[PDB]
Design an enzyme around this catalytic site. Structure first.
Site, PDB file in Angstrom:
ATOM      1  N   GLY A  22       0.764  -1.230   0.000  1.00 11.63           N
ATOM      2  CA  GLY A  22       0.000   0.000   0.000  1.00 11.63           C
ATOM      3  C   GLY A  22       0.801   1.289   0.000  1.00 11.63           C
ATOM      4  O   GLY A  22       2.037   1.284   0.028  1.00 11.63           O
ATOM      5  N   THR A  23       0.059   2.395  -0.037  1.00 17.70           N
ATOM      6  CA  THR A  23       0.593   3.753  -0.010  1.00 17.70           C
ATOM      7  C   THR A  23       1.603   3.934   1.115  1.00 17.70           C
ATOM      8  O   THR A  23       1.599   3.193   2.096  1.00 17.70           O
ATOM      9  CB  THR A  23      -0.551   4.760   0.209  1.00 17.70           C
ATOM     10  N   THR A  24       2.477   4.916   0.983  1.00 18.22           N
ATOM     11  CA  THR A  24       3.433   5.139   2.044  1.00 18.22           C
ATOM     12  C   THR A  24       2.881   6.238   2.956  1.00 18.22           C
ATOM     13  O   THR A  24       2.192   7.153   2.503  1.00 18.22           O
ATOM     14  CB  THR A  24       4.839   5.480   1.458  1.00 18.22           C
ATOM     15  N   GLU A  58       0.625   9.550   1.613  1.00 21.34           N
ATOM     16  CA  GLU A  58       0.537   9.666   0.166  1.00 21.34           C
ATOM     17  C   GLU A  58      -0.848   9.206  -0.302  1.00 21.34           C
ATOM     18  O   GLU A  58      -1.295   8.115   0.032  1.00 21.34           O
ATOM     19  CB  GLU A  58       1.636   8.810  -0.483  1.00 21.34           C
TER      20      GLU A  58
END
Lengths: 244, 111, 233, 198, 250, 242, 243, 241, 244
Positions: A30-32, A47
């Site tokens: 997933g997104t950071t 993010e």
């Protein structure tokens, strides 16, 4: 033999719990997102990958508040994250109801910890597909934490997780070394915006949206508030400038 | 000891014309010898051309009307927006009231 | 591989995937197409109704949740009935208890959370339906996309179902245009019917084949079918 | 209360029960049969609370009939009375007790002797030559205590009853509208349709 | 959450064997040897305290436990299972007997209770059989002295003398040679100590051996005086010293 | 094994899909809706000559204005009928009126997916889907005469004509050409009687086939053998007249 | 057949693989700890390893204060370690509430061992990959050390050690007691007992320690507490002026 | 707490647990029923795998549900008891609430319903039983004969058989029972019944029990002799040819 | 989930058999043989103690014959522990009956109940059946002396003579050979011992390996008497029947 990775509470011959380990994969995918502890608070940033022009900007908020003084952000399966926050909320309300005082960050961390660890005890449930960075200000200071799918969690100076977790951790370590006296709420907000932009290089394909929130004893009175308007653009620029 | 009931007074009147009908009610709401309000609506428009008033104990009257209005709303949701005939509303209200046969809504209702 | 990690929702694959949920997402794709888009005053739902035989009706795809909210479905009809019904209650509860109309954003969170409980427990199955929620609340017009995975997203427009990608590129292209179609319902509806026909191929939207719905500033969520949509074909 | 009389003679058991059913100020019926046949050779008369009365009787009946069929056998009067007593004893400590008193008259085909059981609503059972519930015993027991003999014939018993009922019709304040009499013997249960003037 | 294991983990195989019970018996076989000998005026149960480390304090771990003041038990197999079984046994002795009849249960009945608890772990949903075999020795006014063995299946049998665990076969043999219906308690204690010696590899003293008996009443272990009929417990764990004393006359 | 409420890689519920396979093996049932009423016919299909054919009940009344025909594992339909009847009667008790056919159907279909071993949605206590499909035909003021097809999938469709069972594909194709908005109750009866004859293994007669209809005037009625024996005769004649 | 290795049921050899594997998990942290009893105190030493620089070292602990008097050190993953600590604290609190006196160290140990024994028998609960070492100065038994494992087993120790290099630390201590002939560290102050503990921790592991490589817990009459980096430093300094 | 779905659909649209339940019925001793013009007769074969039984006490194959209705079966004996008990209870409950004994169809539909329920309820297997229920509706004289199976399906028959070799015996009945003219006599009805069992019993005067049910709760089981007399008269009909 | 480890103890084989019941029976077939013979004036229950030792206390033992009522007893073949669970419920059922009707429970009614309990473990609950087969010997004033038998399937039947456990085939044949309806208790007692003696898998048939019981209506009284032979009483009747 094999098949040790098919049920949630099974120990493999080497003592691991493969299902928890596979959940971690959903997290790394997933997104950071990050967290930066400062001299009197904490800053959260994340993010928000923009799938298309159709996503209304600033609407799909990912950072969440627990009670009035705690911030939570996470990477991985978003629904699992919300599920975890709902529990954190009941956990916080419960604590305040009986003790009057708003729940301490360390206390809140363990509530989440025990709940997540609980989901690694039976094969009738699956582990959480998120790593959560959360914290806030309490009776004695600021606290930053990161909770893994295994229920493991520790206190951090700075923390990151998701796709660009290595970049971020790298940046964070530099900040830690070059600021032994402590960063400031104002500064960390910018520093956070930077780290997110840099860490975005591991996903540079799709355009993204930045989101920051903070909880500082002096800047927010010890309450969790989102960074908007001026202070937000100011940090976006501080980043856009150093990404070149 | 605690008494769950009260009396807010009021009077309501319903007259069925040949191709019309009226439901009137004063707007005074009282408690013993004091006036709580000189204008507190007691007759309501519940949709599907049905007017209703549950007079007597105000808290109960309010709960009943509120429950019936919500009943009309679900009637639409469940029966493809069909209109609720006055006779169908009446039978429905009976069940609403009898559901509390042992802790009655202390109201005299007219639709 | 997959075959060993898709027997139930409570199992993660080695890559960190939830196959049962993905198989659910597939039922959506296999479903008829539907589109959603909004201006700043209105929100419109356009959906293509599918039929079995030429002797059967065209299963509805739009459901009203309250006076200010509604949605279109794609996938398992029964699951949409269950989810829409739960949404109907939440709206109802918000009115009866707080005398407040439920914010579309909040309805999305509620849907997300309900769907999520079905992807972490044993014996339960994920919902096999996608939803497009529109509604007008205290912050304007809104459109939401709901995925069985529990992922809810707010958009200016979007579509789901088979060939949905057509309408989605069209809208993503038409953005600046329809977004300003304020104070003019009929113009947003046409813009919507144009996006949906961008996913046609089989046939062309007929009278008892097209289904449209709208909500807005002074427009209570209402649905149009048949003769009522004739002026849009 | 109503009249429930029972007497065990030589080869049978006789049960006499009042026919009136009074509800407040009016006598609703005057041909009521306050009895239920539990099996071919067991009869039960009852008196007490308005609704519980028949409800209990019918409940006991259904159970005995079910036992009869499951076992293709008829329980002894003693076994039936023990079942009935236990049911009343449960009831007395329940939320809302069955306020019913009963007389169980049966002919035990294995012992070949008639039997009479008296059980009140508390579950108080006792086997007797003759018995009654309510005020009935108060007027009749002095007569039975006098004329009763273990070797009496069914005909002698009906005469002693007639005497009892006459005393009841003389000294009792209420018009119970006569009684219905039934006999239980080796040949089942039969009703004396002629006691209005026997 | 919630135990969704509402089915048996022990089932019959085509041959008619009950796998889990067999396997549990195997676990008992690997267990340290323990034994029981019944004399005309007492019973003795003994075992070896196989310390898992010299840093451990073997006294803090009892393999011989008092169930009632006239009944004791020892085992072979899985220690932890034994421990919980003892807690349950002591408790069932009260809840299903002492709190009802005002007295402690007779040996056969308590054994019967224990056996029931073990039988259930053989058929109840979601559990495995206990991996232990117990030897319970006791005395009661109407049956006198008795010794029983309880297995994972829940089966129990009375013995004059017997052994379980590792060297049970050898030990049972040595017992058939020295047993007779006229042994006095001290004779049985002696025979017990000898039997156990064959099974112990290393040290053999009062600190490596755990031994208890069911003999006469010990009014000195009662804790009070004033009630004639209360004469004290018949169960007694021999002290480290008491054991060594008899080891010399070995 | 595999959960009873598992999705296939194609996004289908195995149990429901297999459920449909069972329905294909059932007796044929046909329904035709005309502005003069709805006709419902079924294939008795006795398994042996010793079986008393009229004890075969595959067409049942739900209320005076609703009737239904079944196909597939018929036993599985008893509780559905029970639920349906109750739902109709209850609706009338609560609203002093007739339940809308569509609403009655929706209620029945709500049972459909209530199966599993512990699905996180309510208390769906039923080990498997139903192994039977239903043709629900009735009448109401708002939408007049109606025919519905309720499947174990939970979904239901409104049809002008419909055939379910072993002869469905064949019979459905037939209905496609034969149906038109102006059919009469009389025509529809013969049409149903005819199409049954084509798909039935046996020679259709008033003993291995049964008709019925629902009209606003006399409600739902099940044609007795005599009445049908004639409609059969009348068919043989009109077919033989070209 | 092959499932007798996934849940806690017997294998044909009469073994419980899941319990065995849980034991394997206790060494995941690569931490070693040891406990010794003083004349009137009990000390537990445990390695502290903080690899990640982004971590707040003050929150990385495997030593817990269960009650005013009982201390517990854990060897195993932290999430299971915290699960066991919370339970222990609740059990200690409830016990004091129901019985009127502080729960003895050995009793809490037995209670936890019993809980563990259950995960060993009931199939829906997995064992906890941890080993629990409880310490205190009991009011009846004095300095006490009781350790429980995933098998549900527990016993009291004169001194003990747990972790990957458990055997080296153990034999080191064994040798020391064969020498001194007593079952404890004949020291009056706990500071010296803490020093002995750190010393032998070094001899056995063959490694030097800074003030942040250790974690120390001390139990005394009516109290159990952990030392600070500085309290430890003071200990390290003293052992340095002898070597 | 156990609710595993044991009866589920397989790819071909079949429910194996139910299907296998039928295999258990095919393995049960044969049972036959034929309705005359004024009665119904139930016949059942007696196994002979072991003989040294005490027939007085050993449970018989025909059971009374009420004084006017009987039930026979093929399949697992233990399973049939559970159904018979529920049936008997339901019969008494019906009399207590409707104030009229059950009709044969009602009682049949009730048992069938119980069977159907066990085909789609968690944690239970279907009944390995098939039944024949016969009798006379209260105050009626028209004979009733019904059959139920594991699936929950039921229907009435002029004559019918179930169990092992039922295939054979049904054939005999299909070409020996004329609906136009049903066995107008209790005697010729019982005869037809014995005749059909002989096709499969292979000489069993002690292997063929019969029960005759007439209107108004007139149920009676014949004795070895009475039956053996029909056997005797039937074997001659063959030889006298 | 759990389903993975469920044996499904209550399903049909493709042949229409109940696996667990079949296997349970197979298990019982290895249990010490138990016999029941019904005479005109009584009933005999004899059973062979499977496996023994010199140290086994045979006086306080009772592994195969249990008194259920004062007029009913059972002979056990199978898992002793399982049998005790059932025996105890049977003992309770008998008393509930006595309390309810003030009459001793008719033998068949008690047997049918235990059988229904066994039948239950066969159709629902997912638990293994009881590995027990019973021979009920009892008397009541409706059928006098009766002999029944029930196995794991929950099915029961009546007999004049019957055997359960090991070598029942050889044993059944021997009984069918020497049984005569007009027998007398003592005749039966001898048939019982002879039969066991020939089918035993052991060297000799000593008293220490036997349990004997009779239900006679001792002429000198008029009531029924249950007698569970004591070791000595067995050793005696063993010499008299010429088996010394």
């Amino acid at each position: 033999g094999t098949g040790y990775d098919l049920s949630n509470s099974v120990f493999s011959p080497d003592g691991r719990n493969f299902q928890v380990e596979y959940a971690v994969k959903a997290v790394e995918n997933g997104t950071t997102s990050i967290g930066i502890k400062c001299n009197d608070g904490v800053v959260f940033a994340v993010e928000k990958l923009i799938t298309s022009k159709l996503l209304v900007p600033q609407k799909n908020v990912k950072i969440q508040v627990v009670d009035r003084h705690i911030g939570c952000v996470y990477s991985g399966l978003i629904p699992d994250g919300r599920h975890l926050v709902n529990r954190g909320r009941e956990e916080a309300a419960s604590f305040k109801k009986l003790y009057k005082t708003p729940i301490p960050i360390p206390a809140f961390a363990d509530r989440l910890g025990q709940y997540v660890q609980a989901h690694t005890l039976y094969n009738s449930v699956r582990p959480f597909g998120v790593s959560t960075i959360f914290g806030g200000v309490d009776k004695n200071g600021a606290h930053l934490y990161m909770l893994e799918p295994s229920g493991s969690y520790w206190g951090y100076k700075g923390a990151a997780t998701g796709k660009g977790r290595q970049s971020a951790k790298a940046e964070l370590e530099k900040l830690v070394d070059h600021h032994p006296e402590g960063l400031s709420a104002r500064e960390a907000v910018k520093q956070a915006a930077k780290i997110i932009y840099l860490a975005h290089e591991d996903n540079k394909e799709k355009d993204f949206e930045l989101e920051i929130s903070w909880c500082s004893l002096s800047e927010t009175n010890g309450l969790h508030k989102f960074v908007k308007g001026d202070l937000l653009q100011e940090a976006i620029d501080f980043a856009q400038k150093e990404i070149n | 000891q605690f008494n769950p009931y009260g009396d807010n007074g009021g009077t309501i009147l319903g007259i069925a014309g040949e191709d019309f009908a009226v439901l009137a009610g004063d707007t005074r709401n009282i408690t013993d010898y004091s006036i709580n309000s000189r204008y507190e609506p007691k007759v309501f428009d519940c949709g599907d051309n049905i007017v209703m008033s549950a007079n007597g104990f105000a808290a109960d009257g309010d709960a009943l009307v509120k429950r019936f209005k919500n009943s009309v709303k679900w009637y639409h949701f469940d029966h493809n927006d069909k209109k609720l005939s006055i006779n169908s509303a009446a039978r429905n209200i009976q069940h609403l009231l009898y559901g509390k046969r042992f802790f009655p809504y202390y109201v005299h209702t007219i639709i | 591989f997959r075959n060993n990690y898709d027997g139930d929702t409570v199992t993660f694959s080695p890559t960190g995937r939830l196959f049962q949920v993905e198989y659910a997402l597939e039922a959506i794709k296999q479903g008829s197409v539907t589109v959603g888009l909004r201006s700043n005053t209105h929100a419109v739902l356009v959906a293509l109704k599918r039929n079995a035989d030429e002797l059967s009706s065209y299963q509805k795809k739009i459901i009203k949740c309250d006076e200010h909210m509604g949605l279109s479905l794609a996938g398992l009809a029964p699951d949409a009935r269950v989810l829409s019904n739960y949404l109907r209650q939440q709206c109802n509860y918000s009115s009866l208890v707080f005398n407040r109309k439920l914010a579309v954003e909040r309805a999305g969170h509620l849907l997300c959370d309900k769907a999520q409980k079905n992807t972490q427990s044993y014996g339960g199955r994920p919902y096999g339906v996608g939803l497009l929620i529109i509604g007008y609340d205290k912050s304007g017009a809104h459109l939401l996309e709901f995925q069985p995975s529990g992922n809810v997203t707010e958009l200016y427009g979007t579509a789901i179902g088979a060939r949905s990608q057509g309408a989605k590129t069209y809208l993503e292209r038409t953005l600046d245009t329809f977004i300003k179609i304020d104070g003019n319902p009929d113009e947003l509806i046409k813009a919507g019917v144009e996006a949906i026909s961008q996913s046609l191929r089989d046939e062309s939207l007929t009278v008892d084949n097209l289904s449209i719905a709208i909500v807005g500033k002074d427009t209570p969520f209402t649905i149009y079918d048949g003769e009522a949509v004739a002026k849009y074909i | 209360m109503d009249i429930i009389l029972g007497i065990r003679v030589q080869d049978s058991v006789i049960l006499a029960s009042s026919k009136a059913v009074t509800r407040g100020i009016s006598v609703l019926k005057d041909s009521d049969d306050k009895t239920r046949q539990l099996s071919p050779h067991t009869l039960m008369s009852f008196a007490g609370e308005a609704g519980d009365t028949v409800q209990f009787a019918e409940y006991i009946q259904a159970n005995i009939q079910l036992y009869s069929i499951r076992e293709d056998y008829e329980l002894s009067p003693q076994a039936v009375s023990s079942f009935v007593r236990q049911e009343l004893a449960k009831s007395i400590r329940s939320r809302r007790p069955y306020q019913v008193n009963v007389l169980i008259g049966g002919y035990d085909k294995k012992k070949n002797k008639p039997e009479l059981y008296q059980i009140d609503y508390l579950g108080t059972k006792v086997e007797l030559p003759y018995g009654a519930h309510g005020y009935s015993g108060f007027y009749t027991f002095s007569l039975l205590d006098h004329h009763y003999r273990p070797d009496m014939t069914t005909e002698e018993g009906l005469d002693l009853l007639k005497l009892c009922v006459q005393e009841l019709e003389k000294r009792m304040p209420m018009d119970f509208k006569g009684v219905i009499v039934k006999i239980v013997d080796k040949d089942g249960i039969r009703q004396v349709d002629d006691f209005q003037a026997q | 959450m919630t135990d969704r294991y509402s089915f048996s983990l022990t089932t019959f195989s085509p041959s008619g064997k009950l796998g889990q019970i067999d396997y549990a018996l195997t676990a008992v076989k690997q267990g340290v040897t323990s034994l029981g000998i019944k004399a005309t005026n007492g019973v003795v149960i003994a075992t070896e305290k196989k310390s898992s480390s010299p840093l451990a304090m073997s006294e803090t771990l009892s393999k011989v436990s008092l169930l009632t003041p006239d009944i004791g038990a020892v085992y072979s197999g899985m220690g932890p299972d034994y421990r919980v079984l003892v807690d349950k046994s002591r408790k069932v002795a009260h809840t299903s007997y002492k709190r009802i009849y005002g007295e402690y249960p007779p040996t056969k009945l308590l054994v019967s209770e224990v056996a029931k608890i073990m039988q259930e772990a053989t058929q109840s949903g979601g559990v495995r059989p206990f991996g232990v075999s117990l030897l319970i020795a006791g005395h009661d006014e109407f049956n006198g002295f008795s010794l029983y063995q309880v297995d994972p299946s829940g089966s129990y049998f009375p013995w004059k003398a017997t052994a379980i665990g590792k060297g049970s076969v050898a030990a049972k043999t040595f017992l058939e040679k020295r047993w007779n219906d006229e042994l006095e308690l001290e004779d049985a204690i002696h025979i017990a100590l000898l039997t156990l010696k064959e099974s112990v590899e290393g040290e053999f003293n009062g600190d490596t051996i755990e031994l208890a008996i069911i003999g006469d009443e010990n009014p000195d272990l009662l804790g009070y005086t004033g009630i004639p009929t209360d004469k004290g417990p018949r169960f007694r764990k021999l002290t480290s010293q008491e054991i060594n004393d008899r080891l010399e006359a070995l | 094994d595999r959960g009873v409420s598992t999705f296939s890689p194609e996004g289908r519920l195995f149990q429901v899909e297999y459920s449909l396979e069972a329905i294909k093996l059932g007796s044929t049932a046909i329904g035709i809706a005309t502005k003069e009423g709805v006709v419902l016919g079924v294939e008795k299909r006795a398994t042996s000559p010793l079986l008393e054919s009229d004890s075969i009940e595959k067409i049942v009344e739900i209320d005076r204005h609703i009737g239904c025909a079944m196909s597939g594992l018929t036993a599985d339909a008893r509780s559905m009928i029970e639920h349906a009847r109750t739902a109709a009667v209850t609706h009338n008790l609560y609203y002093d009126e007739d339940i809308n056919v569509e609403s009655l159907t929706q209620s029945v279909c709500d049972l459909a997916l209530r199966f599993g071993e512990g699905a996180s949605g309510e208390e769906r206590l039923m080990s498997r889907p139903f192994g039977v499909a239903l043709l629900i035909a009735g009448h109401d003021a708002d939408d007049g005469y109606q025919l519905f097809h309720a499947e174990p999938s939970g979904t239901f469709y409104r049809y002008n004509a419909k055939a379910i069972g072993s002869g469905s594909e064949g019979a459905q194709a037939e209905l496609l050409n034969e149906w038109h908005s102006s059919l009469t109750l009389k025509e529809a009866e013969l049409l149903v009687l005819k199409i049954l004859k084509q798909v039935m293994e046996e020679k259709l007669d008033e003993n291995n086939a049964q008709l019925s209809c629902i009209t606003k005037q006399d409600g739902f009625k099940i044609y007795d053998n005599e009445k049908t024996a004639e409609l059969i005769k009348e068919l043989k004649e009109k077919e033989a007249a070209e | 057949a092959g499932y007798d290795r996934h849940i806690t049921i017997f294998s044909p050899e009469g073994r419980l693989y899941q319990v065995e594997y849980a034991f394997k998990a206790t060494n995941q942290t690569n931490i070693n700890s040891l406990a010794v009893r003083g004349k009137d105190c009990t000390v537990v030493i445990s390695q502290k390893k903080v690899p990640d620089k982004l971590l707040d070292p003050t929150t990385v602990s495997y030593i817990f204060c269960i009650s005013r008097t009982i201390g517990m050190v854990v060897n195993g993953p932290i999430p299971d370690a915290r699960n066991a600590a919370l339970r222990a604290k609740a059990e200690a609190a409830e016990f004091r509430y129901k019985y009127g006196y502080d729960m003895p160290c050995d009793v809490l140990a037995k209670r936890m061992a019993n809980l563990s024994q259950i995960y060993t028998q009931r199939a829906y609960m997995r064992p906890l990959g941890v080993i629990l070492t409880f310490v205190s100065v009991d009011e009846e038994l004095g300095p006490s050390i009781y350790k429980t494992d995933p098998a549900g087993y527990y016993v009291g120790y004169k001194a003990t050690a747990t972790g990957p290099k458990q055997q080296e630390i153990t034999t080191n201590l064994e040798n020391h007691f064969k020498k001194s002939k007593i079952d404890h560290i004949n020291e009056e102050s706990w500071e010296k007992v803490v020093e002995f503990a750190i010393t032998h921790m070094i001899d056995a592991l063959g490694t030097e320690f800074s003030k942040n490589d250790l974690e120390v817990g001390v139990a005394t009459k009516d109290k159990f507490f952990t030392l600070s980096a500085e309290n430890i430093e003071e200990r390290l300094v003293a052992i340095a002026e002898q070597d | 707490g156990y609710d595993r779905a044991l009866s589920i659909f397989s790819p071909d649209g079949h429910i194996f647990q139910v299907e296998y339940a039928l295999e258990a019925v095919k393995r049960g001793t044969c049972a036959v029923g034929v309705k005359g013009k004024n009665c119904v007769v139930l016949g059942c074969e007696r196994r002979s795998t072991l003989k040294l039984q005490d027939t007085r006490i050993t449970p018989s194959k025909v059971s009374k549900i009420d004084s006017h209705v009987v039930l026979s079966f093929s399949g697992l004996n233990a399973d049939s008891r559970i159904l018979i008990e529920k049936a008997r209870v339901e019969a008494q409950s019906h009399r207590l609430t409707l104030e009229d004994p059950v009709t044969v169809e009602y009682l049949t539909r009730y048992v069938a319903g119980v069977q159907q329920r066990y085909t789609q309820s968690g944690g239970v297997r279907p009944f390995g039983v098939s039944t024949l229920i016969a009798g006379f509706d209260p105050r009626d004289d028209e004979p009733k004969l019904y059959q139920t199976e594991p699936s929950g399906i039921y229907s009435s028959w002029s004559a019918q058989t179930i169990g092992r070799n039922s295939k054979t015996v049904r054939e005999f009945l299909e070409k020996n029972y004329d609906r136009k003219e049903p066995p107008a006599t209790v005697e010729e009805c019982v005869k037809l019944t014995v005749r059909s069992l002989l096709e499969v019993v292979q000489t069993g005067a002690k292997n063929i029990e019969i029960t005759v049910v007439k209107p108004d709760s007139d149920i009676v089981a014949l004795s070895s002799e009475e039956i053996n007399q029909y056997v005797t008269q039937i074997e001659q009909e063959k030889q006298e040819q | 989930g759990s389903r993975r480890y469920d044996s499904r103890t209550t399903i049909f084989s493709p042949e229409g058999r109940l696996y667990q019941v079949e296997y349970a029976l197979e298990s019982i077939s290895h249990a010490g043989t138990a016999i029941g013979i019904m005479a005109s004036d009584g009933i005999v229950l004899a059973a062979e103690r499977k496996v023994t030792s010199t140290l086994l206390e045979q006086d306080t033992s009772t592994e195969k014959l249990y008194k259920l009522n004062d007029k009913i007893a059972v002979a056990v073949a199978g898992l002793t522990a399982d049998a005790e669970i059932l025996i105890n419920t049977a003992r309770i059922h008998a008393q509930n009956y006595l309390k309810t009707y003030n009459e001793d429970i008719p033998v068949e009614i008690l047997v049918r109940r235990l059988s229904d309990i066994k039948q239950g473990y066969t159709q629902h609950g997912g638990l293994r059946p009881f590995g027990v087969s019973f021979i009920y010997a009892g008397y009541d004033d409706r059928y006098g002396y009766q002999l029944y038998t029930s196995n794991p399937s929950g099915n029961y039947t009546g007999w004049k003579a019957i055997s359960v456990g090991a070598n029942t085939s050889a044993a059944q044949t021997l009984l069918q050979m020497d049984y005569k309806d007009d027998m007398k208790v003592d005749d039966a007692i001898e048939l019982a011992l002879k039969t066991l003696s020939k089918t035993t898998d052991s060297s000799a048939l000593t008293y220490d390996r036997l349990e004997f019981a009779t239900i006679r209506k001792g002429a000198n009284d008029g009531e029924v008497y249950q007698k569970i032979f004591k070791p000595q009483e067995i050793k005696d009747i063993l010499v008299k029947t010429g088996i010394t």
